[PDB]
Amino acid sequence: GMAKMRAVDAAMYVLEKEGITTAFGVPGAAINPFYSAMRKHGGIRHILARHVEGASHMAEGYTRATAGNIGVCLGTSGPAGTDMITALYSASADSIPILCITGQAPRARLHKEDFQAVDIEAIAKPVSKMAVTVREAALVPRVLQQAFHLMRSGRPGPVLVDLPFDVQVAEIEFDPDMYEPLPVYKPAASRMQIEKAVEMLIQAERPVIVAGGGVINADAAALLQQFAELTSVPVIPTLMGWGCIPDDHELMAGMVGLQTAHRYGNATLLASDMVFGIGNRFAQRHTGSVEKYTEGRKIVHIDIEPTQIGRVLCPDLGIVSDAKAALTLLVEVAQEMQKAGRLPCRKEWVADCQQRKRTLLRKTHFDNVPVKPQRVYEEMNKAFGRDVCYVTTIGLSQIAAAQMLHVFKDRHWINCGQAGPLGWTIPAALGVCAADPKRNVVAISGDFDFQFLIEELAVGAQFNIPYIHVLVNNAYLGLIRQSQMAFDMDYCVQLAFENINSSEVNGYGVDHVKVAEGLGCKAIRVFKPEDIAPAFEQAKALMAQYRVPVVVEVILERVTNISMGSELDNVMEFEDIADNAADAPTETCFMHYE
Amino acid sequence: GMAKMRAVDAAMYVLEKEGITTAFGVPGAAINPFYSAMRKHGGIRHILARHVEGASHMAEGYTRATAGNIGVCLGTSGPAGTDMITALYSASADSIPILCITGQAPRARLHKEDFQAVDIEAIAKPVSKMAVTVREAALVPRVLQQAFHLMRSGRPGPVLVDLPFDVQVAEIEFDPDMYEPLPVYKPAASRMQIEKAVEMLIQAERPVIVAGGGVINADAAALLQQFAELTSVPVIPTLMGWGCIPDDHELMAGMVGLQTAHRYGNATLLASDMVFGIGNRFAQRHTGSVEKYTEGRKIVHIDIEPTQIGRVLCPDLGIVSDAKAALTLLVEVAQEMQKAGRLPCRKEWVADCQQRKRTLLRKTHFDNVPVKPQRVYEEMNKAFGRDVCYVTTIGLSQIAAAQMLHVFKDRHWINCGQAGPLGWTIPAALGVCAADPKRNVVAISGDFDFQFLIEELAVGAQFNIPYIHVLVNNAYLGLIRQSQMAFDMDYCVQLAFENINSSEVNGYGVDHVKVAEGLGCKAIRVFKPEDIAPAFEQAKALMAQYRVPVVVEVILERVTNISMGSELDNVMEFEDIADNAADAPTETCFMHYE
Amino acid sequence: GMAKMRAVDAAMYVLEKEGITTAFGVPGAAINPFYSAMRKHGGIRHILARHVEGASHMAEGYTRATAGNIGVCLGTSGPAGTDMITALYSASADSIPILCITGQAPRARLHKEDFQAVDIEAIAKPVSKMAVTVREAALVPRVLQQAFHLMRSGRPGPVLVDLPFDVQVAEIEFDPDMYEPLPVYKPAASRMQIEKAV
Numbered sequence A, B: 001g002m003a004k005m006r007a008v009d010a011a012m013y014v015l016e017k018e019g020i021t022t023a024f025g026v027p028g029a030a031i032n033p034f035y036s037a038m039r040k041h042g043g044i045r046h047i048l049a050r051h052v053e054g055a056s057h058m059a060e061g062y063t064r065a066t067a068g069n070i071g072v073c074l075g076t077s078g079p080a081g082t083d084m085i086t087a088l089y090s091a092s093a094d095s096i097p098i099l100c101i102t103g104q105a106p107r108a109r110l111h112k113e114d115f116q117a118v119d120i121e122a123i124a125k126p127v128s129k130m131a132v133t134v135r136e137a138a139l140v141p142r143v144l145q146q147a148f149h150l151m152r153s154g155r156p157g158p159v160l161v162d163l164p165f166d167v168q169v170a171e172i173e174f175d176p177d178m179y180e181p182l183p184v185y186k187p188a189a190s191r192m193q194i195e196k197a198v199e200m201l202i203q204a205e206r207p208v209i210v211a212g213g214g215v216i217n218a219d220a221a222a223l224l225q226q227f228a229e230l231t232s233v234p235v236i237p238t239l240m241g242w243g244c245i246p247d248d249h250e251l252m253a254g255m256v257g258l259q260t261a262h263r264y265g266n267a268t269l270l271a272s273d274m275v276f277g278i279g280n281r282f283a284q285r286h287t288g289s290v291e292k293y294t295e296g297r298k299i300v301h302i303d304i305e306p307t308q309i310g311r312v313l314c315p316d317l318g319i320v321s322d323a324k325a326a327l328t329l330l331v332e333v334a335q336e337m338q339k340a341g342r343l344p345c346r347k348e349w350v351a352d353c354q355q356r357k358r359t360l361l362r363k364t365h366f367d368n369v370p371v372k373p374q375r376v377y378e379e380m381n382k383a384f385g386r387d388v389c390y391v392t393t394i395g396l397s398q399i400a401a402a403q404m405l406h407v408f409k410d411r412h413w414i415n416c417g418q419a420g421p422l423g424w425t426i427p428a429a430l431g432v433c434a435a436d437p438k439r440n441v442v443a444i445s446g447d448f449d450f451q452f453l454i455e456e457l458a459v460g461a462q463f464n465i466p467y468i469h470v471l472v473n474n475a476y477l478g479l480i481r482q483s484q485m486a487f488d489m490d491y492c493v494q495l496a497f498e499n500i501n502s503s504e505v506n507g508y509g510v511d512h513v514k515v516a517e518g519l520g521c522k523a524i525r526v527f528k529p530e531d532i533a534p535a536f537e538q539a540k541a542l543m544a545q546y547r548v549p550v551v552v553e554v555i556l557e558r559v560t561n562i563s564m565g566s567e568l569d570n571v572m573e574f575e576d577i578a579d580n581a582a583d584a585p586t587e588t589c590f591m592h593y594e
Numbered sequence C: 001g002m003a004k005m006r007a008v009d010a011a012m013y014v015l016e017k018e019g020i021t022t023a024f025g026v027p028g029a030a031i032n033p034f035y036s037a038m039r040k041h042g043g044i045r046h047i048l049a050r051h052v053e054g055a056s057h058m059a060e061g062y063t064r065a066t067a068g069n070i071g072v073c074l075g076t077s078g079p080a081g082t083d084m085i086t087a088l089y090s091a092s093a094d095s096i097p098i099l100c101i102t103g104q105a106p107r108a109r110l111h112k113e114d115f116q117a118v119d120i121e122a123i124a125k126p127v128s129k130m131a132v133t134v135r136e137a138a139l140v141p142r143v144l145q146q147a148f149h150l151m152r153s154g155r156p157g158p159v160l161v162d163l164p165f166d167v168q169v170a171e172i173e174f175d176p177d178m179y180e181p182l183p184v185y186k187p188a189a190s191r192m193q194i195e196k197a198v
């Protein structure tokens, strides 16, 4: 029971009681007492990153992989905390938690100019639900107790706890048997709110549900699908809701937006007369101008956060609720409406949505050499199973991937959708693998994203954390090249050079095979479209054999303009469209997934 | 003269008038108008980094290389700004400027949740002299005008300017011929202050001058040396003042502190009866406990910043002044004192200091296999000329380097002494090379520091920026291993693994030769001490031939405890000491440098 | 000559050298050492206000009356500083200085919920050129030295100096004869600009 221990020893018991089994980090002198307590305690597995930013994005990937996870990022004082700000921003932006823990100078030296001492509390305040320097050893367990409440309650977000060295080593009395986690706060919609929403949905003649990341955050994907099935209402996931209904479900109507969207999704949204928003937030890249998005449509919005409702557009209804609590009541009310005979038949509207989904396509089956990126995504759909879990960040690589890959379960699209920090992909993929060693993790990066935190591949090598990384290499910051076309320039976006050690990369610059191999991983380079599928098969074998990351680099044509625009009705199609399966053979209408 | 132009076009004229010729950065959609103006203007050379943190440390290295330089770091909105915080902290901590410029969401969308939009103003406020989102196009030139005043005035520090997209493209009227930089504010010591300081120095019987980074910041190294020569007072540079008097000067008495210090330096400081501090700040790693540092000594402190004086200890005098203004007056007063016959002879004290410097040494000439790191620094002193410019960050690599390398001019030790962010070394070295293509740049890293931002080697390859990188590889976070000895543990600090592609690294993990070569550079691995010198000679040839970075990796013994302690009188010597040149042959007393 | 004295005694010499002769205030337990030093030094005339906001606006009027004047407003910890915010805003907004000085809890107790202790540094930062809690006794003269530079230089504005009780009473070595005010920073137009304007 009660015993004297260091405050960091009490912290290890609190982390255990809060479900922590894993931590990613980089030790240093100011956080050694915490590492010492973690060693003494056992049962937190620590993964040593090769950049503090890598540890912080591994924590994000760990959080995102499985409902209830909270990835932990550990670091020393000074520059370690400033290397975590980008991940705190990314987690805050997507409403997900990570717990960052930093060492700090001793309490009495906080305003001297101690070596590597920085006011991380002030720096991290704008990108966290709480950032606190702990000022008493006895408060260490209580600050952690509050941190877990905040990371799980309301709109989730990250916390940073900063630990002065003397506060860590100071002796307190603590009884782990008496520690209890705080209750989680989640508001819930009343029956009066939900009956009104269902009445409005029954009155609409061409409704769609927009299912956002809040549905996945609430672990409510099955309920979201059940509610759509009972009401026969087509579903448009946001990028952050993608996966909460399977892509081959008859009611999955595609995605909507300016970039990561389908031609059928935008066409269905523009044809609809109501948007029933559940756990979304009507993001600018999803809506375009709100005036066009809302034109002729009633808008319902269910959100756990009151100040998200009406922030970018005014809903017709507006309900504060956790998405699971709300969907539980929505299913119950829809079932009462079904027994009463009050749910309208929607065969015509569902048929119109399905015809758009069958005809408004984009070509992927390109035989071109050098390779066209859209062909890579076709081969990925064929090579990987229905249970594949994609991890990606930003770029033409990621945008075309969201346009052309397919996903069939929640938390199988892992993507920092609001912040998009380059270098996220490798560490995030490692964090997903650490959360679930049985997950079939496949990452997608362009060359520039792959280079930012390329050294993290050695983390997968040292710890034998296997996954497949698809690397689509155009020797370009391709998205920035495309956005520069409006300035009639192509400027500071090229990465090519004649590699003095590798004439075989043909002026593409970095030799990613040699780099990945030096970092202890396996790698395959593909120049021809027909060699992609065999490369994915060899990569699976190399993964099983060596249990390390395997990089499949596809050499792309330098310049491909991916479809995008400034409004839902203005997306330009630069590359070939398709209206037939032969040009787009991995649409779920045409292909059975696993 | 007067003409209508975009506010970013006016910004290009302001940067030109402020002396900017170089920028390091990563473009993105929100900062494209600025890149468009930079292309149209010409005459800023842009270097494309492969991590935004790399661009920001290149800017730091560019600033530090040459008095009057201001390195510029450019990036897009969102995660680009959060990737700059570590460099803003490092520059602030060392009192040097960089100018960070970020794109931002349009003014009217700042409080929506725009894609990749973050409150960088609030995040960067604690680590900058000014961080401002510019709210009017006409203010863009005025905010830059104020930024340059702040970066050069008082205690120098960095500025971040955040540019909403609509503010960048908006039309203003601007006349470059009428633009003038603001005057720089620097307080100057009065003759009454300086005569009092010289009186106190004349009264001391065993004085030392502690010459800090403020002397180099003020570009006053020649005056600092002249004042010491006229008064015959031995000089102890801080780590940040190192180089402001040559290491082979008869009055250079070594360095003082807990880690980057000499046995003779600490012994001389403890034997002295006055510390005449010029442009230093009495840092904790320099003093140990202030009670022991100041015991029996009068303390003078000249600093440009009033609130640095008395922050960590109370000086006997205390003078607010720019170091150049102060040293100009100190030389004049010392010359008047010399003509009056009032400067005491100091032959005995100078002789006592020189005898300590001849006898209180540490061994470097080790024949051990695997290699002992102290032998690497001996070979570097022999291989490189007197004009070598070292760039380094933190680790046992850097601490023993400061103990054992020698430097002979100001701004030939380039080191982020207060913040020490890992990954600093490669980008900082590239920034020094960009500032001065004729500089003989040699970097020193341990393996972990080298890995953080290893991809920046491809920046040197793509742009042909040559320098030599000495990489001392112990497959350890060696400094953290050593600091863990107090916790009787060795935990989460090892980087070794059996590399499945390279049995020749013998379980050391990452193959840095293969990685550096894939990134387009040249690399040599050394296992035996006698092969170091020939490797440095081949590296010079490869550099001249290919004009890319050349990495010389020395495989170290896994475990070496570098000398350090908690007080000046308590530094533990784990490895062999020396009292003879044969064991320490590159001390300047024994070796003529170039 | 140099002498041992409390930091608040050294503060009185700095104020005298910077031309202060008048102060408006309301004493309290946390600022008593400053009042004790003011009494011992003499030659600052103190006007006792009947509201801390009254003292703060007296300081504004004193500044505005005569070029070079800097009104000084004194108060205790806690609510006294929050009562000065409206004047700090009013002074900032018109580009004129006042010097506010508040007492504060001892450094060791700044994050305990000590009686009448508030984070005035954070509250006043938006409406001052500087608002600082002084962390070392030796810094009191240097913080005041910088404050007078800021109040006179560039666009003028007010400063709040927040003084922990232990910092006020701690002894320091200070030589009033060696203190000198900092130079004032004022940019000047060149002839090229004035000729263009004419």
Ligand SMILES: Cc1cc2nc3c(=O)[nH]c(=O)nc-3n(C[C@H](O)[C@H](O)[C@H](O)COP(=O)(O)OP(=O)(O)OC[C@H]3O[C@@H](n4cnc5c(N)ncnc54)[C@H](O)[C@@H]3O)c2cc1C
Pocket (backbone or CB within 6 Å): A093, A094, A095, A154, A155, A156, A211, A212, A213, A214, A215, A217, A218, A238, A239, A240, A241, A256, A257, A258, A259, A260, A261, A279, A280, A281, A282, A283, A285, A286, A302, A303, A304, A305, A308, A321, A322, A323, A324, A393, A394, A395, A399, A416, A417, A418, A420, B115
């Ligand atoms: C290059 C690029 C292109 C993109 N293109 C598009 C595009 O075309 N279309 C598109 O839609 N997106 C696109 N995205 C992603 C986009 O930026 C947003 O991240 C995304 O649209 C947000 O989805 P969401 O509305 O579900 O919001 P989320 O960020 O997932 O958050 C929605 C809401 O969930 C709420 N919430 C949290 N927990 C709960 C809970 N338990 N119960 C209920 N509510 C809860 C939060 O309060 C929040 O308001 C793109 C991203 C990138 C990087």
Ligand SMILES: Cc1cc2nc3c(=O)[nH]c(=O)nc-3n(C[C@H](O)[C@H](O)[C@H](O)COP(=O)(O)OP(=O)(O)OC[C@H]3O[C@@H](n4cnc5c(N)ncnc54)[C@H](O)[C@@H]3O)c2cc1C
Pocket (backbone or CB within 6 Å): A115, B093, B094, B095, B154, B155, B156, B211, B212, B213, B214, B215, B217, B218, B238, B239, B240, B241, B256, B257, B258, B259, B260, B261, B279, B280, B281, B282, B283, B285, B286, B302, B303, B304, B305, B308, B321, B322, B323, B324, B393, B394, B395, B399, B416, B417, B418, B420
């Ligand atoms: C692992 C490690 C070990 C280290 N070990 C030691 C050690 O043993 N000993 C040691 O000394 N350092 C050591 N350092 C470096 C140490 O942390 C400090 O960076 C260093 O001591 C500061 O030197 P300085 O006092 O010259 O301060 P600086 O940071 O260089 O600043 C000194 C002052 O210069 C002033 N100033 C700025 N511009 C001007 C101007 N124009 N005129 C006048 N003043 C001006 C500033 O206001 C500031 O107060 C170590 C660093 C690391 C990473």
Ligand SMILES: Cc1ncc(C[n+]2csc(CCOP(=O)(O)OP(=O)(O)O)c2C)c(N)n1
Pocket (backbone or CB within 6 Å): A394, A395, A396, A397, A398, A419, A420, A421, A422, A445, A446, A447, A448, A449, A450, A474, A476, A477, A478, A479, A480, B026, B027, B028, B029, B052, B075, B076, B079, B080, B083
């Ligand atoms: C830290 C950071 N800096 C800048 C950006 C802006 N950005 C978005 S995509 C992109 C280029 C992506 O290049 P690559 O990963 O090669 O992908 P491609 O578009 O070529 O497929 C950049 C610089 C960002 N997201 N994060």
Ligand SMILES: Cc1ncc(C[n+]2csc(CCOP(=O)(O)OP(=O)(O)O)c2C)c(N)n1
Pocket (backbone or CB within 6 Å): A026, A027, A028, A029, A052, A075, A076, A079, A080, A083, B394, B395, B396, B397, B398, B419, B420, B421, B422, B445, B446, B447, B448, B449, B450, B474, B476, B477, B478, B479, B480
């Ligand atoms: C971002 C960051 N995280 C952590 C640290 C703490 N730190 C200082 S030295 C060190 C290990 C250095 O290892 P390496 O570069 O291999 O050098 P070695 O000490 O082994 O010579 C670490 C982690 C830091 N300085 N910066």
Ligand SMILES: [Mg+2]
Pocket (backbone or CB within 6 Å): A051, A451, A452, A453, A454, A455, B051, B451, B452, B453, B454, B455
């Ligand atoms: Mg990197």
Ligand SMILES: [Mg+2]
Pocket (backbone or CB within 6 Å): A446, A447, A448, A472, A473, A474, A475, A476, A477, A478
């Ligand atoms: Mg690319």
Ligand SMILES: [Mg+2]
Pocket (backbone or CB within 6 Å): B446, B447, B448, B472, B473, B474, B475, B476, B477, B478
């Ligand atoms: Mg090492």
